[PDB]
Paper text:
In order to address this void, we selected SthK, a prokaryotic cyclic nucleotide-modulated channel from Spirochaeta thermophila. We showed previously that SthK is activated by cyclic nucleotides and its activity is modulated by depolarizing voltages, making it more similar in this respect to CNG rather than HCN channels. Similar to the eukaryotic cyclic nucleotide-modulated ion channels whose structures were solved recently by cryo-EM (HCN1, TAX-4), the SthK channel is a functional tetramer and the structure can be divided in three layers as viewed from the membrane plane. SthK is a potassium selective channel, and displays a traditional potassium channel pore architecture where the selectivity filter, encoded by the TIGYGD signature sequence for potassium selection, is the same as that of KcsA and other potassium channels.
The apo structure adopts an architecture different from any of the existing CNG/HCN structures, which is expected, as it is the first apo, resting state structure of a member of the CNG channel family. We present here the high-resolution cryo-EM structures of SthK in the apo, cAMP-bound, and cGMP-bound states in lipid nanodiscs. This is, to our knowledge, the first apo, resting structure of a member of the CNG channel family. We will call this the ‘activated’ CNBD conformation. In all our full-length SthK structures, whether apo, or ligand-bound, the C-helix is swung away from the binding pocket, most similar to the only reported apo CNBD conformation of HCN2. We will call this the ‘resting’ CNBD conformation. Roughly half way down the membrane, in the middle of this cavity, the side chains of I215 pointing radially towards the pore axis, constrict the pore to a diameter of the size of a dehydrated potassium ion similar to what is seen in the HCN1 and LliK channels pore. Thus, it is possible that the gate in SthK is located at a previously unreported location, in the middle of the cavity, which is the second narrowest point in the permeation pathway, after the selectivity filter. Since the channel experiences a membrane potential of 0 mV on the EM grid, and the median value for voltage activation is about 85 mV, the voltage sensor is likely in the down, resting conformation in the SthK structure. Since these channels are in lipid nanodiscs, and we see these densities in each of the three structures at the same positions, we assigned them to lipid molecules binding specifically to SthK (POPG, since the nanodiscs were assembled with this lipid only). Conversely, the conformational change is less favored when less efficacious agonists are bound, so that most bound channels are closed. Our data shows identical, closed structures for the apo and inefficacious, partial agonist-bound SthK channels, which is consistent with the concerted gating model (the functional states - closed - that we solved with cryo-EM are indicated by dashed green circles in Figure 8E, top).
Residue numbers in the entry:
A (entry chain A), B (entry chain B), C (entry chain C), D (entry chain D): 10 to 65, 80 to 415
């Protein structure tokens, strides 16, 4: 955090050179009551390269490092030889390459390139305006209203509006006008391309979800499906969008490695698995094996989770919704279960057919565990394998 | 549905302020025979925030809530201090954030952003035209033909045409012209970017299908394949496009959860599975286990589904097409089977070689069931396992 | 193929109306020595709707069907009431919706939308030029050089160049100029958006392949891999691009259904499997089971396919390359094998260690068969299971 | 490498014709003191087609091959018949189709199309400027300042700026101006479309990684997860970006074929597997079977790899990080292990519970081997199966 203020100082110094140098190439009456900031700023640029080595594709800084300027501005070099004082303007490559990585994950990398392009376009419109003001016929004109017309012209040309009120006169103006018309078309094409690349990927999570629903609907209309069930599928996708933004559960935490996925499943199913009267007193490495084999399912409002009279093979842990427990005639309510609790646990040890009917109330988000998977990962731990038989 | 008319009323009130405020900052002769709508509208804006709390990133509404206006327009505040009456124009952020979610799934979210941008561009071209008309040299000119020229100018500049018939004169006009040339280039770049993002994803289902066929064709031309079979593959992809829009069956209903996928398979194979003389009288939880293990295949016209003399291991249920049953010499037709019926059922219980040849007639869309899968999910139900032996 | 010429005739008739109607709304001296084509063309439009029903979102054709025109042009209706003769111009929606599906898979659907947009832009620039020529001050001017200036103006405005040599004069011209400046910006944004969507997906097969190689290279440089092997991987990807255009073998023919995939594998491995002295005389349903379980691998030039002294478990069928067979010291060449033949077959029946070393010569493209897969699908056919034991 | 200089010579000759031919169609005073390069260049073009056949969609070269020119320029053919000397300009299709494949994998194919388009736009702006200079009213004007104004005009029109200082006068100028306004809008739309397609796919690896992290974060905020673990996941994704650029290990080397994947795994795990005292003296075909079944996992700093007292089933090989070995109380350090070494090896032969606790120090990048996979691929090699029992 103490080199960040130095990078900001370097950015300020090179932004100062980018504003000052083409403005003083036109006006010789400057630079003399402003030389001390030249001294401070060239000392800053020559002192940057030891801090560019220590505590920190190298030749832009090396070419901006030397005082190639101050020699033109003292010895009063003529026009086609003065322009090498533009070599300091190569410093912006170094500042660009530093700022494109010191904050390359705070913000969107498309927005960063767009802001950098807008910065370079204004900072280069200043230089083009200074060049246009340079190759004018000299006359008595204050240095505000001869710069303001040149900046008006180089904005009218670069933004391709082209009013045409003030135009080239001489051939040496017309060649400069042709080459910056090419630069204006290039910069404005780059701006439109960056805005197009910025607003194309602007909504991807919300457009991929919209494409998937349109896919499922246009498939199920071919199978001549009922409209009630199709409305229920559409409201399922509305719930799954407005809670977890479209993403499926088991495809998200497949990209985590094993210790992080174990830790996430441990933070989720912590209070849920220290309630059952079968895993009580069991070891830690048994919990960490059953906790990685839970599978998420989502029941809509009014779905039958368990019908009484079915065989029944799985046990359900509730994470988010609520659920209700009914009798075999679906008339007399036994109780109501909410998040943090479980049901259907009397199937891991036993083959018996279900004894109650469990209907959902709202959207549930409940995890389940099979019996085949339970007995498969129960085999290699013989102590719980003998513990469950006395309850069996 | 009674807050929707209130949101429409709020949108109308803030659209009214956006049209009125810069038009009355230029003309002082207004606001006096039009004050009662100011009263009604500021009461609407100050009454919106209790309904913005109850029955409904907060400070735009809070800053648009206070009557910062009417004070400028009564006490006749001068020009650089009057412009704070623009604070009411911050209300459009609230209306934007409400309308971007109350109908965010009726229409395409790209079209919504494009329409919002066109609305803001016209509604801001009005304000820019009022500013241009404000900083004109005053003269005797009716208030229609001095607004019409200003709106003509601010459309010629923002749409980057730039005729150049009426241009800046003073420096204080030229600075305003430079800054709205930048705004015009920005808004027109945003329009081109949104149109490009709208017509890029406009045909995805029809372009992905076209890419897949071009992939398969360019691969099979490398293997030096026959042209007849390649024409048959291309007409298969034409059928699969013009019926179910390219999408494969088993990748679509893999994104549904278990109860919805069960219900869809139940609505499809309802009349198909209550016909066989083996599952008759069998339980409900056996149908719901064989109905999730059917696999779709599609035979073209003239394909051999079953050849007589083969071993034969699977049973086929017809969903959409038609099919014909032939003898072992493929000369004497036995019968014809259409949708809703089945064939090949004498292989689940028996090891016997096929006794007839079944050729397709048109494209079939028929589901099949294996014998290994049948015996695998038949093991855990012993009652049907003993029921099938007496037919075996 | 006899309704195609009728659709071309309908397209010609409505293109004729689109060119003629705004040109005769300006000039009253027309329509009288050109009425017989009006008769023929309105008869064509009113006769299209029975052929639009028989042998073939309906109301554009129904509104273009009636002779709402000829009444204006005979009874000489004035200007704000004549414009309903534009109702015939609604026919272009029907021709658009017909042509967007009768050839929707000959060409790229992006190119079709771009060509349709260019057609509508020229065909609407004609109408806008007729409107501009209509609201001019009348004077003595030939009907060529008053149309040519109007078409020059409506191309200078719509393509956003905007010279500004001929400009609006009256307010009723300026309103028309503002509204078609908006239309010009809209049409030119649509053109840039369609060109951008056309050249973005223009090279996808050649850019996805380039991304995959850059991915593999940037991963393997992290593992600090040798440069020789990395050059060999890059030349492997060059071979796989310049033969089958990047696509992997087993992901392409996974999108075909079972009968087409069976037929493709049958056309490939036809002459290859009627050579081995183990499958000779075996049934057809054994070939059709081993021919679906072959797996493609690709060896580079100089790779060791089989080393003599290894255990050896698989048999290799050559499809495209060539290969050479060497002794155990890799010094004395036995023979050379080319496409259509096989090697390594003495491992399906036997457990014996390999007896020769087989090096590749060029890139091979050879299919292999395992021994576990062979014995797994060999179990259910007992006759070949007893046939192979006497060779075992 | 000796046909590359010939392709460069052909490109130079046709670039010479593209610059010269429309410049000499305007000026008749040329071609006479410059005929020897016509002789050399037409001989080059007619000699290209035998080298286009030997050592190397054909008719552009065949139509550019004949000397259709020199006849116009000698016999002084008039204006509407001279223009067939433009047939030589069809050579650029051949040079385009050669250069689009001789370096089609050095650089990005989007940048190549953009550079080709800029080349054709300048090279066609020259021809359009020559045409504009051709249909001018003739007067006394030097051939520099009558070409410079025409090139200024055809750049002002094609880049859609449109100053409007010099405009059409005659109708035959205005038709030419309309048709090249259409060409200017087309070329500038193509430039904006190619820049948009170039900067849209410019950062894909860095944007896909950013989308995946935003996906995981927005999912885990729904599950109400702890902020400490969420910060640990975000720093895991920062490590995985700044080392191997986001790409997962086992999805990258799944696209290599079997011999290259074997060779890569051999170059990685070479010094790692010749250290264990169990595989010492074992055969080569056992190493090449255990080296393909290693699975990469990544532990963060401070994770528990092995807890002392657990059952323990796997052996870990370290590739990149460092790790520390602690006692059962996590207080007394035993030793420290770095890359190239391994731990946990006393579990392949034995069922015993772990005896030490191994915590990570930094990010590890370590490969592991299971015991089920080890015994599964250990079964088919009986010699090592009996070798491990005496250590068991």
């Amino acid at each position: 955090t103490y080199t960040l203020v130095w990078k900001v100082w370097i950015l300020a110094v090179t932004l100062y050179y980018a504003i000052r140098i083409p403005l003083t190439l036109v006006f010789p009456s400057l630079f003399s009551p402003l030389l001390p900031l030249d001294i401070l700023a060239s000392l800053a640029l020559i002192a940057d390269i030891p801090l560019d080595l220590a505590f920190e594709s190298r030749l832009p800084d090396l070419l901006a490092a030397l005082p190639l300027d101050l020699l033109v501005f003292a010895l009063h070099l003529p026009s086609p030889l003065s322009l090498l004082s533009l070599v300091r303007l190569l410093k912006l490559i170094s500042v660009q390459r530093s700022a494109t990585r010191i904050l390359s994950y705070r913000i969107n990398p498309a927005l960063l390139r767009l802001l950098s392009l807008v910065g370079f376009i204004l900072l280069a419109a200043h230089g083009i305006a200074c060049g246009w003001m340079s190759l004018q016929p000299p006359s008595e004109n204050p240095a505000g209203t001869r710069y303001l017309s040149a900046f008006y012209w180089t904005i009218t040309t670069l933004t391709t509006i082209g009013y045409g009120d003030i135009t080239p006169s001489t051939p040496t103006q017309t060649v400069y006008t042709i080459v910056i018309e090419l630069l204006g078309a290039a910069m404005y094409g780059l701006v439109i391309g960056n805005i197009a690349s910025l607003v194309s990927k602007l909504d991807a999570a919300k457009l991929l979800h919209r494409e998937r629903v349109e896919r499922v609907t246009a498939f199920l209309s071919y199978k001549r499906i009922s409209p009630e069930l199709q409305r229920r599928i559409i409201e399922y996708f509305d719930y799954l969008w407005e809670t977890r933004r479209g993403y499926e559960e088991r495809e998200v935490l497949k990209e985590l490695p094993h210790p992080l996925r174990l830790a996430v499943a441990m933070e989720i199913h912590g209070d849920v698995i220290e309630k059952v009267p079968l895993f009580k007193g069991a070891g830690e490495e048994f919990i960490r094996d059953i906790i990685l084999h839970l599978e998420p399912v989502i029941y809509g409002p009014g779905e039958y989770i368990i019908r009484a009279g079915e065989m029944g093979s799985d046990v359900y842990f509730i994470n988010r919704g609520s659920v209700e427990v009914l009798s075999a005639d679906e008339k007399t309510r036994y109780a109501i279960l909410s998040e943090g609790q479980f049901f259907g646990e009397m199937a891991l040890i036993l083959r018996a057919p279900r004894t109650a009917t469990v209907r959902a109330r709202a959207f549930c988000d409940l995890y389940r565990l099979d019996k085949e998977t339970f007995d498969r990962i129960l085999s290699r731990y013989p102590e719980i394998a003998a513990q469950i038989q006395e309850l069996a």
